[PDB]
């Protein structure tokens, strides 16, 4: 079934399987939610990805 797939498709599945996991693992929507409170208080909204 990967003969009907495309190269931009296999790169897109791998990108989502990385992103769908770690959003649910770290609970990233809460990390972005604390960052909005600094946005309304400083005017700054910064994150480090390490």
């Amino acid at each position: 079934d990967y003969y009907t797939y495309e190269w931009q498709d296999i790169r897109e599945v791998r990108a989502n399987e990385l992103l769908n996991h770690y959003i649910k693992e770290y609970d990233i929507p809460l990390i972005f939610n604390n960052g909005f409170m600094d946005a309304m208080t400083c005017g700054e909204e910064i994150y480090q990805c390490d």
Binding site: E12, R14, A15, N16
Partner: protein
């Protein structure tokens, strides 16, 4: 564990150093991709009925989380069934034709029987004419 067999071998085909927005892939939460997601599941629900997508495929669509995998499953399951219906049309066509072949083979067998049935009456009429003439 979080990636597949084909997804882990992407690391070998070169250049993965380069950002994904250089290879045509962007992170997008916008009204275009929610409209494409709501279309692609409504299209699958319209394909679940009329027996175009199996119940194996639709549960893979609900647990996909990527608009291109769930696009390829609609494409893959349509090509499989439309191949199966085209060969089912073909096997039903040749079956009535071999039925048309076996009825034709027996009626010329009936036809060849009555002509060999007739001549052996005719040549034995020559025999019963022959014996008493002595």
């Amino acid at each position: 564990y979080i990636l597949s067999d084909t997804s882990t071998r992407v690391m070998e085909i070169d250049g993965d150093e380069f950002a994904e927005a250089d290879y045509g892939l962007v992170v997008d939460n916008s009204n275009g991709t929610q409209e494409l997601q709501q279309k692609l599941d409504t299209l699958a629900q319209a394909a679940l009925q009329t027996q175009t997508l199996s119940f194996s495929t639709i549960t893979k669509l609900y647990t996909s989380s990527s608009l291109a995998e769930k696009q390829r499953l609609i494409e893959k399951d349509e090509k499989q069934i439309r191949e199966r219906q085209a060969q089912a049309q073909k096997e039903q066509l040749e079956a009535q034709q071999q039925i048309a072949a076996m009825q034709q083979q027996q009626k010329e067998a009936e036809l060849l029987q009555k002509e060999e049935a007739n001549i052996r009456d005719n040549q034995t009429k020559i025999i019963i004419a022959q014996i008493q003439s002595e």
